[PDB]
């Protein structure tokens, strides 16, 4: 079937070329860019002990969750720089944390092969573990809450999995990736999702159907970063090849490349603003090189982190950008 | 408002209770001295030597691809590299894994303890007559002067184990930038825990000397 699989790979890449037309860099070249942003470090969220391997914001955009390999999980109050609900973790090495949209439940997960969910608003006022979602044979790398009871989890066993807290088991398993899957993103209309793995591919998924519908094979290296465009009709991924590229769901190809020749470092966290024309990508040169997101113009450098920025996310209403990094502090950007 | 002031007072009180908790288990955590092993989920053996915590991490359940979860262990005290010491060609897989760990841009800051765990298993294979074909420069290798483990040990076993040691240490010296140092060993061996203690002592000593730029 190896001879057969090359034929539909050649047929799909011609369907990209049949809809190649004009690229996004040529069309958007006429209109005015936003120019230089000059984001500044509003608030430094100090208190994490080891490297901050993962973070997530909230729908309320006030509380953010951030996960560090010390064994902690602090729901940071980003408006006043306050720590609320510092979860002590069973696993010392946590690589994911999704702040639940509703806000009641908080995920974690990592090398323990368990995505453990913590309910913040317990009846006793002390945060405990609701259900430990064991079942993955690989490391938990990204998690995203569908709602208060549904949580798809990216994992290192080449399979993402949709779980249910009420039963503690997998609703469905997404067995399409061929390498250990790194980042995860849910659409704003929460009907479908796309996850990036350590492949050349970041293939799209369906929540209710449970399996891959379209595959976006655009990066050279390990896609550590993924985030939808704010409509949900597109998404940008980021990998270790020092290029982050955007892909459209209605299309099938790479849109246009956000790369610069000075960048010789990997990408770990991409995130999108309220408007689509801004892309916050987090890099391995200890900075977050933000782009214009439509013109390959580096809109700014979010320097100020001494170690590698491993998780940068933006607020749901577009207020701020908080880039957690490996130097054990998050920083709020505006 | 007064209700806004009431919520911020409770938020600050919960924050200072959390700060008290995080000072307490910062005092726990900095005394932990985590290590990483190679060669469910992640396994924990919190062993104490000389009233010093050492929080070992066997990570066997993660699969063969390890390029992204080995980046968990750049802030670790040490990467205890267990080598099967016998040569699929599992020993050269350990050399390539050590070369991948050594030259990794995050693991450049953290040190590796090498142990060669199946050293007692190595003695039957080399005395029977099997690494000469598996390594061409073993013929051209010579034994160093500081190479006496024990007088009853055969010089062929000593030459083989020191060739395997400096086969890792060719990666440790001949490299680019990176602030980290290798501690090879030769292992029933009840002295291994002590060897981990002395090597992590020298690791955190060297980390403080590099913090003073003494290295």
């Amino acid at each position: 079937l190896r001879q057969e699989a090359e034929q539909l790979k050649n047929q799909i890449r011609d369907a990209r070329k049949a809809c190649a037309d004009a690229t996004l860099s040529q069309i958007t070249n006429n209109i005015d860019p936003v120019g230089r942003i000059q984001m500044r470090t509003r608030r430094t969220l100090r208190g994490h002990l080891a490297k901050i391997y993962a973070m997530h914001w909230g729908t309320d955009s006030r509380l953010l969750v951030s996960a560090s390999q010390d064994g902690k999980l602090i729901i940071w109050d980003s408006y006043t720089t306050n720590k609320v609900h510092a979860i002590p973790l069973r696993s010392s090495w946590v690589m994911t944390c999704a702040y639940a949209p509703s806000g009641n439940y908080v995920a974690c997960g990592g090398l323990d092969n368990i995505c453990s969910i913590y309910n913040l608003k317990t009846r006793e006022g002390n945060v405990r573990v609701s259900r430990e979602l064991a079942g993955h044979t690989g490391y938990l790398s990204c998690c995203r809450f569908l709602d208060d009871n549904q949580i798809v989890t990216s994992s290192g066993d080449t399979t993402c999995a949709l779980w249910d807290i009420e039963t503690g088991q997998q609703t469905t398993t997404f067995t399409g990736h061929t390498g250990d899957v790194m980042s995860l993103s849910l659409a704003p209309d929460t009907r479908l999702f796309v996850s990036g793995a350590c492949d050349a591919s970041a293939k799209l998924w369906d929540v209710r159907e449970g399996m891959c519908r379209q595959t976006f094979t655009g990066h050279e290296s390990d896609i550590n970063a993924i985030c939808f465009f704010p409509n949900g009709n597109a998404f940008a991924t980021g990998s270790d090849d020092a290029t982050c590229r955007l892909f459209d769901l209605r299309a099938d190809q790479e849109l246009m490349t956000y790369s610069h020749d000075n960048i010789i470092c990997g990408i770990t966290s991409v995130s999108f603003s309220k408007s689509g024309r801004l892309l916050l990508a987090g890099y391995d040169d200890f900075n977050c090189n933000v782009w214009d997101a439509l013109k390959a113009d580096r809109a700014g450098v979010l320097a100020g982190h001494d170690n590698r920025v491993s998780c940068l996310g933006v607020t749901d209403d577009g207020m701020a950008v908080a880039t957690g990094s490996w130097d054990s502090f998050l920083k709020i950007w505006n | 408002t007064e209700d806004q002031r009431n919520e911020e007072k409770a938020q600050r009180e919960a924050n200072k209770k959390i700060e008290k908790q995080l000072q307490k288990d910062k005092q726990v955590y900095r005394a932990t001295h985590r290590l990483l092993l190679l060669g469910s989920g992640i396994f924990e053996t919190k062993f104490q030597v000389d009233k010093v915590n050492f929080h070992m991490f066997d990570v066997g359940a993660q699969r063969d691809e390890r390029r992204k979860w080995i980046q968990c262990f750049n802030d670790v005290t040490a990467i205890i590299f267990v080598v099967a010491s016998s040569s699929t060609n599992r020993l050269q897989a350990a050399l390539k894994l050590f070369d991948s760990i050594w030259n990794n841009k995050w693991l450049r800051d953290t040190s590796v303890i090498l142990f060669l765990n199946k050293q007692d298993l190595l003695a039957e294979k080399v005395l029977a007559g099997k690494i000469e074909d598996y390594f061409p420069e073993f013929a051209r290798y010579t034994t160093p002067e500081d190479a006496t483990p024990e007088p009853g040990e055969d010089p062929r076993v000593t030459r083989a184990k020191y060739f395997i040691r400096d086969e890792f240490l060719r990666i440790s010296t001949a490299s680019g930038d990176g602030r980290h140092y290798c501690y090879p060993h030769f292992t029933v061996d009840t002295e291994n825990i002590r060897r981990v203690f002395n090597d992590c002592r020298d690791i955190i000593q060297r980390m403080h000397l590099r913090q003073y730029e003494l290295l």
Partner: nanobody
Amino acid sequence: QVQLQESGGGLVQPGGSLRLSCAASGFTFSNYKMNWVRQAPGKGLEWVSDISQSGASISYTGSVKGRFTISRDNAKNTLYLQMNSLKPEDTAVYYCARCPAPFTRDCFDVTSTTYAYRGQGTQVTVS
């Protein structure tokens, strides 16, 4: 698409020269450290050789160190591997394992099972 179409192999007598090549398109060849990994049936994935960017650091496994040489072509975007004086022990399935991150001197998981930047492979049978 990063696809890795290897070429070469076949029924070749031991001691006879063979040119191993992989197509290796979809990624920038000048940035990536490049690899060769073999896998015998019932043995497992075994690393053979690596070449760095522009051939700076070239190391070999000890089975083939005195008898193999590896070359790469940055302009033609193609990795090569000469084989000379073959014993019949290395009848393995050779596979042009590519290192995952380009600008890093390290190279993980090219002997890992179901690796994404590893080709389908060409059967190299010697008898």
